[model samples]
Target: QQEQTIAEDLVVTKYKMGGDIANRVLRSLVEASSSGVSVLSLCEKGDAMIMEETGKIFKKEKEMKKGIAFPTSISVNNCVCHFSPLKSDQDYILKEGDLVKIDLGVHVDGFIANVAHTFVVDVAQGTQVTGRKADVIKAAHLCAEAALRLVKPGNQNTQVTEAWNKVAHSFNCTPIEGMLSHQLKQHVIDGEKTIIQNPTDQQKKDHEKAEFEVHEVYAVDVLVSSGEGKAKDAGQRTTIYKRDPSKQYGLKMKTSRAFFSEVERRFDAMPFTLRAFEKKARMGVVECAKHELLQPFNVLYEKEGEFVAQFKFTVLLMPNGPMRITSGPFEPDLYKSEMEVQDAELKALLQSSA
Candidate 1:
């Protein structure tokens, strides 16, 4: 029995250090998210967690700074993206039929990592998540799979958008328009290169048709909407934000200066939550945002009855092709989509060896 295990080539198992930490932390957050826990706690739990995890290593380099590259933001269904909440506001507790999308990020030093998963709670269906809920998750997952393959050298963002549309269309869903993935460099989110889900004609004009190059990192975020893919703010605060480098502004308060200083010092201009700062600093962000000293990752939502599914992964494009380091604990079998990618080119791409 043991000899048979080694028959299919050498089955050596080991984890890459940076990738493993990202994978481990995200997996814990994915599982820690349960029916009883409120969304607020998980964000705090994971934030402290990865920092704790980051703190232990690199003990030799006492001066080196490291922590959460991107804070854990669990955006539940129809709650479009980056919905890490302020504890004073309303919170969500996990329940069945609620499609949960858990997004988490970690950085050791300046390098960044991220992963997201769509978890559906259904007490009756066993592991199987059926119906339109399943359809959207499956579509979203497949699009990310397609991205890992297509987001290699020489591929255009236009091609990625086309592939996403075809895949989402197969499941009778729409890729969330305006929700885009981006280059993952030393700092986090909003790099020059990007892959847009579904851009408006106006947006299309504004965006440059960027091409993928080797030795680049991308936080490939894929989100799908069952109804209209449109999103609006709907009064939720933009909890996730990052300071704008090269853009300068002096703030009013003493802590605001310290707070803003600590932001760049620790977070390194990566997307962070107000909760990441211990629920303080009311308008420190306001003057910063108003002066364009900060960029906002605003919470967004579709219409009340609408549903959206998401899967985000951070990948490093090497000479070996696009390598997905941080990935979700996605059980592809649990979700069922009657429709699958029918595009021969897309299917052929997926079926190919990676």
Candidate 2:
């Protein structure tokens, strides 16, 4: 019967708890992404790990919702985001040079922690990777760390967007155009406030500029590309989706009704992959999406031969400073890029502590 924001000490602790699970799951998956590994098993590992880890805490709160805030999506080179595969779909065997991006999330009582990291497989132990792949990977990581420093209360989201462009360009990388990082609320993954990356002229004209404030939470997701930064859906079957409680329609089909009911009961407003459902789910999604009863998280891609790297973390803008709840175990020394942050101001910003 009261407010659910991080204004309460309990809410802040919930966010931290969720973030802790996300960090562990992300690190575990990163270590598991070796060459010749099956992406399907990795995806399954991520989701199963989230459930197993969340099962340990808050034993007293028997009814508390805690588990995957977003399903495990392992997007490879040139694939931009949301590539969690169903059992029936063709699976990918991760190769030596594949640039793998592991994106996942966890939630405790609706507070969410989302994190993603991009790394290339087959780097000999203790050795480093170089060339354009390293450039883009380093660029994306720095962009994430830069955003972490800039997301303090009273800072404009535009400043973080601008810094991303500057830092990415230094390494000859471009952020995926028009990608957004959203402010998250309880039961809401995509909130009204947003920070957009690499907006085109038209998007810049329409995208609203907003400022961060104390106690607000955000999932700051950044994706950078070695190509022109445009992301196109190469017609990959969309797998992930979340229900839209804002819209209502009486059941028109039995399959869709059953699917909708399960989604409402199990996942609620959080993003879920068809990997979580049975084969008949594909049939139900069509009707639910057509009528706007569900929102689809479509799989996307950049041009072929162009690598894309991503980093996402959940942070809370506290009264004293911003506290990041989730992040990947990125070792900066592993990536040796020819380029680095050049601008004096941007360089100093990156040098500062998050």
Candidate 3:
């Protein structure tokens, strides 16, 4: 067998570092949720903890002040993703039966590990979850598991998409549309090779198809909804942003110049949250976004009272097989799905070892 390349070794090391950092943040979120903390407060707390942890872990890197690719998101119920609230955003408290999705990402030397998990707050009815919410959550979990198994050398991206789509359909839920599982690269969280959750006719025609190769890494995201599966912006200002290295403009404002310089020095090409900056920096952020120098991540929401569940993790397509990192128990036993899985290949895929 051929030995791993130096680039492969570096990628693996960075991925492991990123995964460990992400789980530490995950533990903090779980503790906060169990302790009856407000969602807004928990998000803020998680952000601070992630920053502190990153500083300690990646201490040698003076350029990257924080290793977060995006702000920690604590989206609840109908909110799909990217709902990390700043101090100016509305307050939200977690309640019983609320399905909350805690999504976060960490990076080491530009290799990113993004993870998202959905948990139903105190919704235990004697060892099994009940009703439509349970169904959606289980569907998301199963879909993600099935998708992860398909991340092998030579497997086409469409295969994962088809498997996830079938899993969602079996549970009478819809795969949340417009979400993509991207092949990750150094300094790039969203890569060119992507697997769409629910591909449209246009995408089928226009989107490039790709096959997995050994040593490539990916962020596989599976989201299911018990609604239209179409998420819309909820009129909230985007709190998450990333610098576009290709974009440039002459800034007229001093604050914009300062903010731009700070971003270039600290975050470089990585994603960051508005909460990382001072209140006065908000104006500069807007100015940078206006000129397309930064990409903003909007808060997405499903219909009111609808339930959305997500399961995401980072995976490496190693020569031995697909090695999944940044994953934990999705409480598979707690969620019950009566829907029949009719695809034999998908069944085998779900049962296969990763």
Candidate 4:
């Protein structure tokens, strides 16, 4: 058997450190949720909370080069992803029966550990999820687990997507369209090799069907919606952006220059949020983005009253087997779904072996 490559070995070490920090940060978020703070309060303090946790972790594990690979996204209900509201946005508080998804990432030497989990803020904080919310969560959990198992060597990226779609349909939920699970390389979170969450025959044909290989890393993300899988922009200003190293232009304004300089200095090539920049300095970023110097992650939303569940884990395909490094709450005990999972392979895939 081939041994892990040099890059793979380095990323495995980096992922372990980064994944540990991400797990701690997620625990803090849970604590915040149970501490009686309103959802608005939680969202407001989320950025600071992440920064504080990252700082503490970095001090303890000095190998980490930076804190977060992307901003902490606190999306609720219809909001699918990238819904980290600015301080100026309208206050939205967490209420009973609200479905919330928290997505965030951490990177060491550009090897990113990105993970996301969906939570229902029920009457009891630590209690198992119940009712319709439980169904949606189960669909996402089972699909994510099944997809993770297909990460072994020789499986095509399309196979993972097809399996994930089958799981979603079995749960009577629609797989969110156009969700790409990308391969992660050093300094790059979204690499060329990608697995589409829900793909048509033509879409699958156009996608990369390369076989999975040892030492490759992937962010296996599964998102299911109780409504139509189509997601549309909600017209809110985008909060997340990544610096485009390939695109460059002369900045006429000093503010733009200052903003660009800070982004390059602090964030390097990773994705960042508006909260990371000064309030007044945000306009400068807007100016820079206009020139295609940055890529924006707009807030995505399903239809009103719809629920979307997202579960993501970073997987490393080592020589031994697939090793999943990131995980959060996935309680399916109090859940029941009408969807019958008849696929034997998928059934075995959902087992805890991988």
Task: Name the top lDDT candidate.
Answer: 2
Q: State every prediction's TM-score relative to the real structure.
A: 0.91, 0.98, 0.93, 0.90
Minimum summed lDDT over a 10-residue window in model 2 is located at: 1-10
Relative to the true structure, how large is the alpha-carbon lDDT of every model?
Answer: 0.78, 0.92, 0.81, 0.78
lDDT of 4 by residue, 1-354 (tens): 533332555657768878887776766775566423465466446556556656765477576576778777878888888877677776567776678888888876677888888877754645666555666778888888888778788888878878878888776788898789888877887788888878766776777778999778888888899887899997888888999888999999898988999889888888888776656667887788899998898889999988899998998888888888887766666465655577787786777576
lDDT of 2 by residue, 1-354 (tens): 565998889999999998999999988898898899999999999999999999999989899999999999999999999999889889999999899999999999999999998889878987899998999999999999899999989999999999999999999999999999999999899997999999999999999999999989999999999999999988888899999999998878898899899999999999999988876898899899999989988888988899999999999998989989898888899999888788999989888887
Q: Is candidate 1 or candidate 4 better by TM-score?
A: 1
| Candidate 3, 308-328: lDDT as tens digits | 999889988777887777974
Candidate scoring better on lDDT of 2 and 4 = 2
Candidates, ranked, TM-score: 2, 3, 1, 4
* lDDT, candidate 1, 1-354, per-residue tens: 322111122111111244567788777877676677788888888787888888887789798666777778888889888888888778888886788888877766566677888887543545577788988888898888888888888889899999999999988999988667888655445777778879999889888898888667788999899988988888887878888897987788776787788877766687788875654455677777888888898888987877799888877776756767778888777777677888889899878876
What TM-score does prediction 1 earn? Answer: 0.91
Cα deviation at 59, candidate 1, in Å, is 1.4
Enumerate residue pairs that collide in model 2: none
Q: Which stretches of candidate 2 lie above 4 Å from their native place? A: none
Instruction: Please give the lDDT score at residue 240 for candidate 2.
Output: 93
Report the candidate with higher TM-score, 2 versus 4: 2
